[PDB]
Amino acid sequence: AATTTTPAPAK
Amino acid sequence: ASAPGVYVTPKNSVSSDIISIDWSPVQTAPYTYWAVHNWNQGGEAGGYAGFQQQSGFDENGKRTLHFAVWDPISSKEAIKAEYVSPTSVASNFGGEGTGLKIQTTYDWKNYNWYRMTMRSWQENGHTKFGQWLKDVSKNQWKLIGIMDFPVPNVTFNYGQTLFQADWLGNGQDVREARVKNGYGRNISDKKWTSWNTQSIEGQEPLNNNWDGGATSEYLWFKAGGDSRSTIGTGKTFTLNQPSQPEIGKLDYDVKSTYYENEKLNITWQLKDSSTPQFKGKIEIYNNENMTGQPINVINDIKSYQNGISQSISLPTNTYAKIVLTDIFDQTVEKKVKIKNES
Numbered sequence: 380a381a382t383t384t385t386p387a388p389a390k
Numbered sequence: 391a392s393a394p395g396v397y398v399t400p401k402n403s404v405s406s407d408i409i410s411i412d413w414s415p416v417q418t419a420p421y422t423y424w425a426v427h428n429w430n431q432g433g434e435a436g437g438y439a440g441f442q443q444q445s446g447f448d449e450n451g452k453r454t455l456h457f458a459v460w461d462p463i464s465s466k467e468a469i470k471a472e473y474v475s476p477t478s479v480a481s482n483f484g485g486e487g488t489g490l491k492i493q494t495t496y497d498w499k500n501y502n503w504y505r506m507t508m509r510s511w512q513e514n515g516h517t518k519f520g521q522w523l524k525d526v527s528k529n530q531w532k533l534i535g536i537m538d539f540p541v542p543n544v545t546f547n548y549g550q551t552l553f554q555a556d557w558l559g560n561g562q563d564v565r566e567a568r569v570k571n572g573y574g575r576n577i578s579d580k581k582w583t584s585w586n587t588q589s590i591e592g593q594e595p596l597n598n599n600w601d602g603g604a605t606s607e608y609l610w611f612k613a614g615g616d617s618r619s620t621i622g623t624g625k626t627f628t629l630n631q632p633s634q635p636e637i638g639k640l641d642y643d644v645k646s647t648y649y650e651n652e653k654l655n656i657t658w659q660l661k662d663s664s665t666p667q668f669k670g671k672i673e674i675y676n677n678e679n680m681t682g683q684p685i686n687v688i689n690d691i692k693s694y695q696n697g698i699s700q701s702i703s704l705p706t707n708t709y710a711k712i713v714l715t716d717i718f719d720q721t722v723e724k725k726v727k728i729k730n731e732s
């Protein structure tokens with residue numbers, strides 16, 4: 380189940 | 391439980407069709423992703439690429455390259471794995487988001503330099519994303535993977551950054567790497583932007599279990615174990631790299647150029663040290679000077695094709711204009727007389 384997420388865009 | 395993320399972010403990146411950076415691993419905790427390229431966060435054709443220590447602490451563990459692009463926002467057409475290298479595997483990912491990833495077994499080594507260069511281009515109404523890797527010590531390029539994304543006119547539009555991430559929760563284990571030679575090629579004017587100035591920043595301003603700095607040679611960063619920030623929540627650092635990147639040369643030998651039983655065979659081999667092939671074209675002329683119109687043209691020779699074999703009717707004396715171009719749009723043209731015997 381490994382996850383490698385990313386940074387959210389600027390709001 | 392987890393090491394804090396660290397981000398290295400150029401001060402001056404713009405919309406690009408080529409992005410390049412050099413990376414060198416120093417300490418390699420398992421479950422570490424060095425995503426050295428990132429683009430279009432929350433956006434159409436969002437993706438990343440880099441290096442993973444998937445298991446173990448050293449070269450005897452599972453070391454990989456990584457490349458992922460998230461599914462199209464509107465289009466129902468699938469992302470296609472157009473090309474995977476012999477040690478590359480394409481698979482669909484899921485969880486909160488979906489898309490295509492290419493994982494590549496790659497025996498990269500501590501204190502060696504690896505140049506990951508990505509290119510995006512328009513082909514047949516779609517956008518292609520390609521991953522190339524130069525082993526700097528071996529002086530050898532390899533094509534890793536090409537994804538075919540079913541939406542035109544997307545590129546590395548924004549969000550250029552590198553991160554080092556612990557994906558499993560082993561904050562006791564230190565991870566450290568170095569980067570230099572960050573460049574993008576501008577969509578606007580096809581000129582290079584030098585990422586000579588980058589910020590190094592912990593993901594969590596309240597977590598100081600990471601550190602970073604720069605020598606005249608490289609930026610470095612680590613997280614986990616006894617890491618403790620010497621630079622507060624983050625700091626900017628400049629390398630003295632040239633404003634235009636040092637680009638090598640395209641260099642190849644034609645291996646065969648012969649016509650026999652109405653079949654034309656033309657093959658070539660790039661030199662070990664050559665920049666890698668992006669595309670090819672071959673014009674065939676009935677005259678040595680290659681005046682007038684070619685009698686035949688072989689178009690759309692791919693990055694991953696090193697020859698052609700075509701059924702074709704030619705006169706006695708034909709000449710081939712072989713036009714290869716590398717991933718940096720450098721073109722090398724050879725004129726070879728076609729031999730009427732194998």
Ligand SMILES: *[C@H]1O[C@H](CO)[C@H](O)[C@H](O)[C@H]1NC(C)=O
Nearest residue numbers: 381382383442458483491557
């Ligand atoms: C991120 O990396 C992990 C660890 O290998 C998994 O492969 C995961 O599926 C990856 N996520 C994406 C979007 O590629």
Ligand SMILES: *[C@H]1O[C@H](CO)[C@H](O)[C@H](O)[C@H]1NC(C)=O
Nearest residue numbers: 383384385386395553555593
């Ligand atoms: C991705 O998002 C998760 C939260 O969903 C964690 O914040 C993780 O640390 C993030 N990874 C990076 C590299 O920012």
Ligand SMILES: *[C@H]1O[C@H](CO)[C@H](O)[C@H](O)[C@H]1NC(C)=O
Nearest residue numbers: 385386387431432433436437
């Ligand atoms: C992080 O970036 C990737 C592309 O690199 C995806 O767009 C992903 O959905 C983004 N995560 C968030 C929280 O926006």
Ligand SMILES: [Zn+2]
Nearest residue numbers: 467516540541
């Ligand atoms: Zn389509």
